[PDB]
Symmetry: D2
Subunit: 258 residues, 4 copies
C-alpha cells in the first residue's frame, strides 16, 4: 500500500507508461484523476483503475489551455476534495530531425506542451498540494543525458522541463511540496514492441536486432519495462521518498549514469 | 513486503543509519547478515531484527582484511546459502581538515575502508549475487556534490567510491547484478542529535540554531531522517528498482540537485 | 594575435560584456560584425573597434525575425565575404520572479530571444562557418549551475540554450564547426557597478556590502571582470581551442564547479 | 607571449604531451622546471626549451617521496626564486582490467602517483604560488566522463584527483591561487601513433581503422592533438584564465560534453 487513500492526478495518459502508471497507483491504494486531450482513451484506463476497486475521474484536458486546466482542478476538488500527487507524464511523440530541418513552430509547440503545460498543471494544483504536503513527479527523458544528432528539439524541451522542475523544488519546498523527475530511455511494452515491429519491416531486419541495438548501451542489456519505470515514479510519489526533492532518477538499465 | 525472503548483507553497521536500515529490512521481510569490526554493537541490532521475527547473523569483520571478508562470505553461505542484497554502509567518521593539515596516512586509511573495503565485499559476494541477480547499494555522501573547505579527504574517498560504483554497474551488469548509490547529507536521529547537543554547548548556542543552520540550504528546511535515507536504500535494494543501475539517488531534502 | 584576419560576428552587443568583447576581438586582429536591435549603441562600439585599426560593420538586427537575420547574413557576406566566429552574447535582462508570478508571455519571449534567436543566427551563418571551419560561442550563465528561487525563467531559457548548444556541437561537428558555451556569473565593470550603486541606495547599504555578498560564494572572493569573461570567449573562438567542442567553460571565480 | 617571464613547473614530463607542453610554454615566454623520475628523458625536453632561448631546470623527482619533492622545491627556489604555474601531467600508463582482475596494490600505487603525488607537489609549491598568485593545472582524463568496462582503476584515481582539485580550488582560492583541470581523451602524436601501429599489427587491421574507431564518438571525427591539449593547459595556466578556478575543461573533440 504505497499510496493508500491518496489522490493521484496523472496528466498525459497514453496507452503505454500512462496506462501502466494508473493501474499501478490504483493497486497501491490510490484514487485517480486521469487527464488527456482525447477522453476516449481514458475510458479503458479508468476501467483498469476501477477493476482494482478504486475510483477514477476522467477529465478531457488540453493542458496548454488556462480554462481547461482550471476546469480540471475544479472537477478534481469537487470529486475528491484533495490531491496528494501530480504526475506529468511524457506523452508528446518526438520527431528525430536535426535542428537544421526542425521548424520553429514545432519547437514552440513542444515547449508549450512539455514545459508550460506541466507548469500550468503544477500551479493549478499548488493549493491542493500545499494542504497535503504533496509531491510532483515529472516524467522526463534519457535524452537530457546525451547530445545525439536528431534528438535536439526533444532534448531542448526536456532540458527546459528539468531546469524548471529543479527550480520548482526550491520554490515549492517551503510549502512542504516535493518535486522530482524520473528519466526513462526506451520503455518496453506493447506500444514499443509494435513500433519495433514497424521499424523491423521497414529496415528489413528482426525485432530482436532492433531491441538488442536499443539495449546495447545499457549495463543490463535489457530495456526497462513500463512496470519498472512506473515503480520509480511510484517511489518518488510516495512517502518512502519524503526526504527526496529536486532529484532526477534515471531508469535506463545503466545506459547513462548520474 | 519489499524484501520478502531476501538475504541482505549490511557492512558497517553503526548506531545510526546502520541500525535503522537493519530494522527496516527485517520489517520488509529480509533476513540479515550484520558485519562490523566491533561485534558488541551487532548484538542489539540483531535483537531489533529478531524482534520482527526474522533472522540475523552477526559476524565481526574488518573489511580491509582479505581473510576476514572470506570468512564473512563463508559464514553467510553456511547460514543462508544465498545473498540478494549487499549494502556498504558509510561508517567511517570524517575529520573536517583542509588538505594542508590532513595526513597522507589518514587519506590512505579512508580510501582503504571506504573504497577498497566496499570493493572487497562486493567481490566476495559476487558469486552469490550472480546467482540471485542481486543488488548492491553503496551508501555515499552529499559531499560529492560540493567542494566546501575542510571536506576534502571525505570528498576524495567518497568520489573514488562513486566512480568505482559506476564502473561496477557496467562490469557486473552483464551478470544481471545492479549497483546503485544513495547520497545522504546529514541524517537526523538520536546520534546526530547528541552531536548537535555537543556542538551547541561547545559554541554557546542552541540545538535549534545548529539544526536550522544545517537545514538552511535544503528546499524543505528539514534534514532527512534515518528512516528517509533507509527508505531510499530499501527502494534501490528492491525489485521496484529492477530497471535501475549505475545511479546515485541523493537524499538531502533538496540541498543539492542531480 | 589570437584572431588575426578572422571575421567575428557578435550578436547582442550591449554596453557591458558585448562592448568589451568587440574591443578585445579587434585588439586580437579580428574584423567585426556588430548586431543589436538598437543601432545607436553600435556606433560607439564600432569606434572602439576602428580605433584599433580594424573594421566594424554595424547592422540593426532583431534576431527573432527571419528576414532581419537574412539581411544580417547578406550584409556580412557583402562586406567581408566570410565569417570565422559567431558569438551569441547574453543581452536579455532577467527578472527575478518565482515561477508563480512569472507570466507565460515573458517566458515565451525569453526563449524566443535566448534560444531561437541564437539558433536563427547560427543557422544563418552555417554556410559561412562550413567554409571557414569556424566556431560558435554562446554566452550562457551560471544560473544553469543552481536552482535558486526567483531565477527560474532565466535558468529555463539558459538551460534550453545549453542543451541546444550541445546538440549543435554534434550536428555541426561533421562540417568541422565547433560550438562551445561560456557561463559567467556576475560580471564586474561599469554597468554592474551602477547597478550595485542603485541596489546600495535602495537597500540602505554600501556597494562594498553588495559586492562582497555577491562574491562570497566564489573561491577567489572576487567577481570576474568583463575582460576575464571576454578572455574565455576569445579562447573558445580561437584556434587554441581547435580540439574543444561541446563544452561549457564557467567563468565564476569558483562559485560553481563543473 | 601568454607566459612571458613566468616560471612553470611541469611534473610528469614524458615523450608525448609533457614534451609538447614544455616546448609550448617556452615558446610563450616561460622558463621551465622539468620533473620526472627518469632524468635522461628530461635532457631532450630541456634542449627543446633552451632552443627557444628560455631556461630549463631538470630535476629527477619521485613525487611519491617527501624528501624528493622537498628537494625539487629547494632547487627551483634556488634557480628561479619564484613559481607562477604548477602543471601535474598525467604520466602513469593505465592498464585496461576489470576490477575483478585488478590488484589492490596496483590501485594503491595509481592513487599514490596520480592523487597524492600531485597533492605533494601542489603543497610543496604553495608558498611560491601564494606569492605569485599563481595557477595549478592538473591534467586529468576523459575517463571521468564515462563508466566503460576495464577503465575502473584509471577512472577511480582520476576521479579522486578531480575531487581533490575541486576542493583545492576552494582551499587555495583565498590565497589567490587558481586550480583547474584539463581532461583529454586520446591525444594524437608520435607516441599514440606508435601505439596504434602496435595495435594494428596485433589485431590484423590498419592504423586508420584504429584511429577512426577511437575518433568515432567525437563530434569532429578527429582526435585532439598534443598541441590542442597543450593549448588548453596554457590557457588555464595563463592570465587569460584569471577569472577561472575550480573548472574542468574537456579536450576531446566533443566525445563527452560538460
Ligand atoms: Cl503513455
Ligand atoms: Cl551507522
Ligand atoms: Cl552587453
Ligand atoms: Cl607525457
Amino acid at each position: 500500500g504505497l499510496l493508500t487513500d491518496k489522490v493521484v492526478v496523472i496528466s498525459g495518459v497514453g496507452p503505454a507508461l500512462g496506462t501502466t502508471l494508473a493501474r499501478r497507483c490504483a493497486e497501491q491504494g490510490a484514487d485517480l484523476v486521469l487527464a488527456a486531450r482525447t477522453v476516449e482513451r481514458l475510458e479503458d484506463v479508468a476501467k483498469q483503475v476501477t477493476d482494482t476497486g478504486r475510483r477514477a475521474l476522467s477529465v478531457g484536458t488540453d493542458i496548454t489551455d488556462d480554462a481547461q486546466v482550471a476546469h480540471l482542478v475544479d472537477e478534481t476538488m469537487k470529486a475528491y476534495g484533495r490531491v496528494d500527487v501530480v504526475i506529468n507524464n511524457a506523452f508528446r511523440v518526438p520527431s528525430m530531425k536535426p535542428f537544421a530541418n526542425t521548424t520553429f513552430e514545432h519547437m514552440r509547440d513542444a515547449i508549450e506542451l512539455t514545459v508550460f503545460g506541466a507548469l500550468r498543471l503544477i500551479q493549478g494544483f499548488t493549493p491542493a498540494l500545499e494542504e497535503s504536503k504533496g509531491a510532483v513527479v515529472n516524467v522526463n527523458s534519457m535524452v537530457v543525458r546525451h547530445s545525439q544528432a536528431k534528438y535536439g528539439a526533444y532534448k531542448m524541451a526536456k532540458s527546459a522541463l528539468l531546469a524548471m522542475s529543479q527550480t520548482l523544488a526550491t520554490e515549492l519546498g517551503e510549502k512542504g511540496i516535493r518535486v522530482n523527475s524520473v528519466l526513462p530511455g526506451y520503455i518496453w511494452g506493447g506500444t514499443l514492441k509494435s513500433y519495433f515491429e514497424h521499424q523491423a519491416g521497414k529496415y528489413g531486419t528482426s525485432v530482436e536486432d532492433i531491441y538488442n541495438a536499443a539495449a546495447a548501451g545499457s549495463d543490463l542489456k535489457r530495456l526497462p519495462t513500463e512496470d519498472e519505470v512506473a515503480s520509480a515514479i511510484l517511489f518518488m510519489a510516495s512517502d518512502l521518498a519524503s526526504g527526496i526533492t529536486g532529484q532526477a532518477l534515471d531508469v535506463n538499465c545503466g545506459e547513462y549514469k548520474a
